[PDB]
Amino acid sequence: CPHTYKPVCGANGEVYDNECFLNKAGIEPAESWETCRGH
């Protein structure tokens, strides 16, 4: 994946550097950033 930084939130609550890494990690895109807020 390109090591650029355009962060995306995964349905597992984890924040990936970009869409490609989210995909590689086999994680569903979260519905919203609320999923990665921490509370």
Phi, psi and omega in degrees: 000155179287137182275035178286166179239103177216076182313139178226149182263128181267151180299345179272006180087355181270144180259117180260145181307325176201173180303321180300313179295324178299312180299313180300319179290359180062039181248140178287142179295141179290164178289319179208166178300342180303327180299335181250014183290330180106348175208000000 
